[PDB]
Symmetry: C3
Subunit: 314 residues, 3 copies
Amino acid sequence: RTIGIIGAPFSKGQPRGGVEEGPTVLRKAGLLEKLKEQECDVKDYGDLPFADIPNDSPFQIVKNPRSVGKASEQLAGKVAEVKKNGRISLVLGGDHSLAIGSISGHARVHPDLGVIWVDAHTDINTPLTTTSGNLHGQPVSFLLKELKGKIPDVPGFSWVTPCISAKDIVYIGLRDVDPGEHYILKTLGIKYFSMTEVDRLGIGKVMEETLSYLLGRKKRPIHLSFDVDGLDPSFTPATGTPVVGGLTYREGLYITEEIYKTGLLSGLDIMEVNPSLGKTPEEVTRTVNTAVAITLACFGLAREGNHKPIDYLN
Amino acid sequence: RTIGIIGAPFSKGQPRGGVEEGPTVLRKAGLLEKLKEQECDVKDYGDLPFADIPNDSPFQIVKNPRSVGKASEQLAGKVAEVKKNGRISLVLGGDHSLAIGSISGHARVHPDLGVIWVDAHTDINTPLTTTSGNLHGQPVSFLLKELKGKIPDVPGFSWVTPCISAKDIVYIGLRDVDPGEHYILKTLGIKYFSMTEVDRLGIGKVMEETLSYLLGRKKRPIHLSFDVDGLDPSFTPATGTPVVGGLTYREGLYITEEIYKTGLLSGLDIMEVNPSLGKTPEEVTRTVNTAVAITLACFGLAREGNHKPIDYLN
Amino acid sequence: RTIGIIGAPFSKGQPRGGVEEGPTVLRKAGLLEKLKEQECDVKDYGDLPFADIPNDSPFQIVKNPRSVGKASEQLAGKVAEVKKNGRISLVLGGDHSLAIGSISGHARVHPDLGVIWVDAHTDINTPLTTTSGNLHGQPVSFLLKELKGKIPDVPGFSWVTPCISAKDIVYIGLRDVDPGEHYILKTLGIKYFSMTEVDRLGIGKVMEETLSYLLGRKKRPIHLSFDVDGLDPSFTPATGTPVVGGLTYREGLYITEEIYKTGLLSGLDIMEVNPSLGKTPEEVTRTVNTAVAITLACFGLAREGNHKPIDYLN
Ligand SMILES: [Mn+2]
Ligand SMILES: [Mn+2]
Ligand SMILES: [Mn+2]
Ligand SMILES: [Mn+2]
Ligand SMILES: [Mn+2]
Ligand SMILES: [Mn+2]
């Protein structure tokens, strides 16, 4: 279970700046070393070098589109590379707009992939339904075959081809969904477990049905796109758009332990960690440490413990 | 789903004073505007003007009885008005002694009502079992037909007629119950889900059985009497009698989302918020914001999202 | 349901010193009085007087063994005394190394006992698998018949005879398990509910299966060994080895309420509370108060309430 680490220091999918240093403080927290400490085969693909696009006026109300466009383009390129090298891509973000490129590149090599999207938001606004203009609240609308016809030609995104259908994604953690997003939800019959459903069924059943929903017809590669604001701000405060009543620390680890155990994790996104928004030094390390813990769980770290197939009573 | 807002600035059901400003900071938090922002039809019935009763010596050990008596009397009057105007009554409290009047007036128009009581306490002490004397720990004993004969004539309450039987109420959130209260519980076979039961079954099953218990024989109006100390002090610290190990934020929203969905909510009480007891400015807004969130959930606000029956892909 | 209180002010099972004042601040928090306030028959057996062993060089990498050895020896003596006096032994700790003596003495009188071990750790390292050397991370390895042959002769422990088999213990709360410990887990087929399992099934089912697992073949005495770091550091911060993602306050009370209700509690350990490690005065009282609450729940205190078999409507 080989990993390809890709740093994605990008922020122009939303207004607040420090999200670009995500790949930096996660790497600083010893992520790749802890992974190696683990069962893991790790190749760092470096931090993608996102060059400035000084001339990038809004498209309608949509902000920084060529910048967001080219950065997902780039990242799409690199993820397909890692996938073609037979490794799980690990995208360190960066705002969630980058999902467009991550899922795009993943599907060029693994078009049958299914998506698990862990988030307080659905990020499925379209350019015409967005009210904020921020592209990190839009990536899913770009990716869905069914929203084909409803995505205008936004500069920076002409390279995009929708690569997943409504039935191939599941949301977990929702609690701040716009009304046009919800319309889209219900209209395309997308499968979701909002905090209501997690409260109702418990994370165990949620994950049962999630995996069953995506793999019951047949095993397929999984892309886990994790926005750390899916977890409660008591666990990941340093993030741009926090919303109270989230997934616990425990629920976050449960989600990823189960995914790990499928053996089918193929692409992972760790997004929206913004150290500059912690209100304290401790809020920063709390958020980083949690994103680290979620990431390690994705690659075999288990709370019941782990050992090698060796005899430990020597 | 039309609402009648009634402010009830009363505190003499217990010792600490600031609970009287509940209707004020909730209104300040933009409650009625958020409701309108929502699907809602809102008529403010004003803040009931509770006049002083300077001559109000204890009855035995029972404190401020004429004051508590007349204020519930008044409120009873006004709730029946709102109900007769075809709207859900929304009582902003105020201490929980006011439940006496709220449920009383509700039942004059809807005698078949069932009660859901969300609270860390059972508030079913009688004047002869109370040890504190505080009437906000007694309202249920006044209301129950079966405790008829065990409620002495307390001044200020001669207008009262018990309007609900033991089988028409359910408790959720209990964790601080006196021994005479528990005797009463078991003796009249009252249905309850204490924190033990919520932990055992989960809030999903709790609400399943609660609704089934009250409506399984036949649909009927519901009175939800919510004491914000039913939720954990980490969520509603600014309250007179906090008790650790409470209902989460999530559980609080779950409870009310399910009630909302019955379509049968008929009377709501939002009680015991006391801004003057927050230990900090933030403890005050945390409590207010939570009571607001619980209140909005009661009237259709859903975490999975909401939209109008319109086509949002225009 | 008669109790024998035994203070065990010992710390040399691990490095940090203040754990020795556990029996002191718990007693200070009014533990025995609250127990008496409860349904309980309480005899204080005093604080065992652990004398210095100045000459106590490591055994290999294992630290303070004669000291740890004699103190468990002593405690073993006293617990058997309390048990032979027909009372539940209540050991106030002290580090968790003392479990060796507590379970040892308990089994001299009740060899058929079953063990519930509530902890973030398995404490089943052997002297040859320990990496730290600290004996409070080893007590289970000493006690298990199946690890017979793999425990070298450590000075201070020659009095020990393994008294429980792999099948007679259940773990609840695990989240920091070494790889040799996990090997042992899987190898001897020990029954455990790690935080993963608690998240998956919920504490209700966990306790169902735990009790069923230990008593389904036949009723037997239960030894509950509770390490307060099994609960989340948000509830018991003043402890030597905290680990995030633990059992809630609620889960902690649920665990013990169910055990209480078996009627079979026979030995209880309340361990690893270290007031000197709270970061604040409040962190100390928070930890103490929680350990108190867990302890009272073990002896009948119920969140739904309690009353005497008397008529309270007089
Ligand atoms: Mn989000
Ligand atoms: Mn997102
Ligand atoms: Mn209460
Ligand atoms: Mn109340
Ligand atoms: Mn431990
Ligand atoms: Mn331990």
